Amino acid sequence: SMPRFVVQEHHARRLHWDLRLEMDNVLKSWALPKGVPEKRGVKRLAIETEDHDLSYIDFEGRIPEGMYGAGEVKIWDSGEYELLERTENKIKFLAKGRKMNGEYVLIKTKVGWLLMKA
Ligand SMILES: [Mn+2]
């Protein structure tokens, strides 16, 4: 296998979370400066970032300084997910994490992306 996701907590120059979905045979990724919404209706900024390799889904450790993406990476949540809807502008999925669970949607508009919880 079932597709999986991870939410990494990344202690870089700006502390953020990274949501990564196994999708298109890579990790489709978004930075979340304020984290995953944990309550219904809350709208969080999501910043599309470059695809990562599938192997990276289980990574934890320190990205060294001078490297782009420096800082400590820790797994905040992880699990399977079920894809419910997808287009170039919308991804709706059921997350099966310990913290991030139930349905969520990533929304692309002219201003970028948002992440929202059912
Ligand atoms: Mn990051």
Side-chain angles (χ1 to χ4, degrees), residues 89-97 99-113:
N89 301 313
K90 177 180 178 186
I91 304 169
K92 175 176 168 194
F93 58 102
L94 174 71
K96 303 179 180 185
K99 303 179 192 173
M100 182 186 196
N101 49 53
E103 294 182 4
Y104 296 76
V105 62
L106 284 157
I107 309 165
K108 183 183 173 182
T109 73
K110 299 188 189 328
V111 302
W113 292 81

Side-chain angles (χ1 to χ4, degrees), residues 10 16 18 20:
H10 196 176
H16 62 282
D18 287 307
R20 312 190 189 283

Side-chain angles (χ1 to χ4, degrees), residues 8 10 12 16-18 20 31 49 52 69 73:
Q8 288 161 346
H10 196 176
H16 62 282
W17 293 261
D18 287 307
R20 312 190 189 283
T49 60
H52 285 51
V73 177

